[PDB]
Design a protein around this nucleic acid. Structure first.
Lengths: 70, 224, 88, 131, 164
RNA sequence: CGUAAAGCGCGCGUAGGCGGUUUUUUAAGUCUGAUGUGAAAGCCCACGGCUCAACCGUGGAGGGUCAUUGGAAACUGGAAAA
RNA sequence: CGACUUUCUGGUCUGUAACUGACGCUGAUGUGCGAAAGCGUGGGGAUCAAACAGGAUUAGAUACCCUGGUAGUCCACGCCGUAAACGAUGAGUGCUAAGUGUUAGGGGGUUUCCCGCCCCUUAGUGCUGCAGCUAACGCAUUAAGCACUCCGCCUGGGGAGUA
């Protein structure tokens, strides 16, 4: 693929996170609060589809803001 | 002639897409490219050698196409050594089925070369001389040095099929036996006298052209 | 639901021999358990489409295989119908 | 579920004609071996070779092609297909292409070409023309 | 391919149309005409061409006709066997005939068969009635027609065991 | 049966139609022979007679999805076994 | 069918191949599901939005335009039962050149460790294309090719989906 380097998953697996490892939250998300989709990160489809629900649950925890603009 | 040590020069081809019709010639692909086998290459080249010499035996005539780059400097050398007419560039539309234009082309050449003697240059306004000089230059350049084409030929040699579809199809329209180099990315069955060898290599095309020129020459110098 | 535990338990008494896993008697039994389960949930949830579609497919397959065992053998049909209490 | 094996073999044969490959693979049958043998005996089949593996077949046949790579037949099809089975008497038996082609027909005594079937005055159920 | 003016010949025209090309202002037309060419002894070929006048157009069609040629497998003044022609919905169907019958077919295909030297033959046009498509289908049927010797060489056996 | 008229919205499925591979068997279909019958006139063929033709006669063939019965069992079908 | 978590529940593929040994396919009639709109019953109405009001353009505009604005859009149970419901391509089965990707897998080699790489096999999911096929456009293993079985349907347009 013409996206960034493939097999970014070398540091995670088989399942993650869901909320206990900020070491894979902040890498995969932006600074304003937005999510980084698959194009820039270079990760796979499945890991993206898990991290989606993962942030959905973690913003539930108040461990993470829905949007961080201030 | 062909020998396996001369077959060791040929290696690889262009690999962007490969026709499944010629997997039989393929030996084994490696390093990301397809390579052609050479055991059948020697036999096929020996045969095509024999047919070309037989064409030469009766007093044959053959064409040399070299429109591809990095082939012209070899194609002219081998054809002029061979003693047969030649091309290295533009095949103007129709050269084996449009005979009514080739005769007029060579006739215009025969006409416009000769007026240089009795006064053609400066013997008149700049407008016509500057036109005729560029006309002569472009005609001899993109037509080539061929001016001996008089009797319709009975066999042809080509450098590449993939560039020269239109002429190989015109020859099929004129049911002429066709021989010429065959890349691994060309239609096999459009040509009946095949030679599965590489064409990108300058040395490969040089040696093939040298051998074919010697073949045509050996067959022509004998009683024809 | 069904569960592999109870499935594997009940098939042992209805299997024609120990080593077999086919023997539609096994299949008719597990299908009957399945249809009762799905029918209880479908009475629990009146409206849906996957449930009734499924029930119809399994009932059709059960009838097809039950008719198959009607021509291979003649007592087996009877013993199954009056043991499962099914196919009135 | 496959409705007819003869249809399969004839489609395989014609689809082998359209691309021209000497070898083809197809699950064999007794009628299939017999009709393959008659195909070789007409001259359309270069060679016949049955093989055995679990369970049936698989009948491997070697096609035939002319020197200029010309297909021998110009068409090939069946007549007796399911639903509408067909039969043929001894005198009524058809001469497709006359001598040119032949008419495979199954009889009470076995399957033979069209000729012998009209010679012996015993007809049968036709299967497929060929020409 | 390989036109020859050495044999005897019989020009035969099938149809002529007045065919028009519309441009701004006037309306440009250019006549058309198709022809079939054969020596009525076992060789035939059709032809097409267009010009602004009849004689030049039909001359063009004829000079292009000899360049496409047909071997016409013939036997006993009749086609060897029966066939069906098909080309672009211009279907056609031929069948041999006992001597003394004569070619019966449509005008164009009659001209095609009369000029290919066939005496007695049975046929009927089908599908489309336009001369060009059914004529081309007729010629296509003659291209994929075979005789006893053309097949007996192919099959391992010989003639006199398989014959019309 | 893409666009021209013509695939219903789709699904579950009865009756029906169709049927994997091999063996044995039945011989219903099928193939094959005979028997009786398919009136005659008519159609077709051959001949003969009204001067010819028309016509008529003669005789032949032809005509059943026909019944009975003698055989064959590849195929369809029935049964049994893999 | 795109909010999340759980409870219950239907389907799909791969591998396996031990197992039941043809039990299969199509399938009239019958039955059920079935977009949105529409309707019955009771709530809720923040927005958005048929009917409708004002203004503006406009010869004129009850249309587009701007500002509101009810039913409606929402929920719960029933009601109806059509659509350009399309891929204008019926379902099931088998065969016929390629290359390129995508989704959920599998086998093998390359690496100290494959997670980094490659090849091979699946099934869908696309494109470019050969043969062939087509009125042509286009179809091309996700056939409109090569065949078989079964079902539906058409036999000029308007009348007319009308009586």
């Amino acid at each position: 693929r013409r996206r960034k380097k493939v097999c970014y998953f070398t540091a995670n697996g088989i399942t993650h996170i869901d909320y206990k490892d900020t070491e894979l939250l902040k890498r995969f998300i932006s600074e304003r609060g937005k999510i980084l989709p698959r194009r820039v990160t270079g990760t796979s489809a499945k890991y993206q589809r898990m991290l989606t629900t993962a942030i959905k649950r973690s913003r539930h925890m108040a461990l993470l803001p829905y949007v961080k603009e201030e | 002639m062909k020998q396996l040590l001369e077959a060791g020069v040929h290696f690889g081809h262009q690999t962007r897409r490969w026709n499944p019709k010629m997997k039989k010639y393929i030996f084994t692909e490696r390093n990301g490219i397809y390579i052609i086998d050479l055991q059948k290459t020697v036999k096929k080249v020996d045969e095509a050698y024999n047919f070309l010499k037989q064409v030469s035996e009766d007093g044959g005539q053959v064409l040399f196409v070299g429109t591809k780059k990095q082939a012209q400097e070899s194609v002219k050398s081998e054809a002029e050594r061979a003693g047969q007419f030649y091309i290295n560039q533009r095949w103007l539309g129709g050269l084996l089925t449009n005979y009514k234009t080739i005769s007029k082309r060579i006739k215009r050449i025969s006409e416009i070369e000769k007026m240089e003697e009795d006064g053609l240059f400066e013997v008149l306004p700049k407008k016509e001389v500057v036109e005729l000089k560029k006309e002569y230059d472009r005609l001899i350049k993109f037509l080539g040095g061929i001016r001996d084409m008089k009797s319709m030929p009975q066999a042809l040699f080509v450098v590449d099929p993939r560039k020269e579809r239109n002429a190989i199809a015109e020859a099929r329209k004129l049911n002429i036996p066709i021989v010429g180099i065959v890349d691994t990315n060309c239609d096999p069955d459009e040509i009946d006298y095949v030679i599965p060898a590489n064409d990108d290599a300058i040395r490969a095309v040089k040696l093939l052209t040298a051998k074919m020129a010697d073949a045509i020459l050996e067959g022509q110098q004998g009683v024809s | 639901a069904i569960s592999q535990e109870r499935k594997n338990e009940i098939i042992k008494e209805y299997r024609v021999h120990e080593t077999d896993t086919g023997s539609p008697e096994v299949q008719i039994a597990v299908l009957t358990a399945e249809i009762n389960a799905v029918n209880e949930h479908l009475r629990t949830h009146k409206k849906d489409h996957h449930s009734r579609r499924g029930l119809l497919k399994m009932v059709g397959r059960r009838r097809h295989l039950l008719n198959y065992l009607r021509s291979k053998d003649i007592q087996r049909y009877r013993e199954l119908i009056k043991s499962l209490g099914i196919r009135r | 579920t496959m409705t007819d094996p003869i249809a399969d073999m004839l489609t395989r044969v014609r689809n082998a004609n359209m691309v021209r490959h000497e070898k083809l693979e197809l699950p064999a049958s007794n009628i299939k071996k017999e009709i393959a043998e008659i195909l070789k005996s007409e001259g359309f089949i270069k060679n016949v070779e049955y093989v055995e593996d679990d369970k049936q077949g698989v009948l491997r046949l070697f096609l035939k092609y002319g020197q200029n790579d010309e297909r021998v037949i110009t068409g090939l099809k069946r007549i007796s297909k399911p639903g509408l089975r067909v039969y043929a008497k001894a005198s009524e038996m058809p001469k497709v292409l006359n001598g040119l082609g032949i008419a495979l027909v199954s009889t009470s005594e076995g399957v033979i070409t069209d000729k012998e079937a009209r010679k012996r005055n015993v007809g049968g159920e036709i299967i497929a023309y060929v020409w | 391919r390989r036109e020859e003016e050495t044999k005897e010949f019989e020009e035969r025209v099938v149809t002529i149309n007045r065919v028009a090309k519309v441009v701004k202002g006037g309306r440009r037309f250019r006549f058309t005409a198709l022809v079939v060419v054969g020596d009525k002894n076992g060789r035939v070929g059709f032809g097409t061409g267009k010009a602004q006048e009849v004689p030049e157009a039909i001359k063009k069609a004829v000079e292009a006709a000899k360049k496409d040629l047909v071997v016409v497998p013939r036997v006993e003044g009749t086609t060897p066997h029966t066939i069906t022609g098909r080309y672009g919905s211009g279907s056609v169907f031929m069948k041999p005939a006992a001597p003394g019958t004569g070619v019966i077919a449509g005008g164009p295909v009659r001209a095609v068969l009369e000029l290919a030297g066939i005496t007695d033959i049975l046929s009927k046009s089908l599908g489309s009635n336009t001369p060009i498509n059914m004529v081309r289908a007729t010629i296509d049927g003659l291209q994929n027609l075979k005789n006893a010797e053309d097949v007996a060489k192919l099959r391992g056996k010989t003639v006199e065991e398989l014959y019309n």
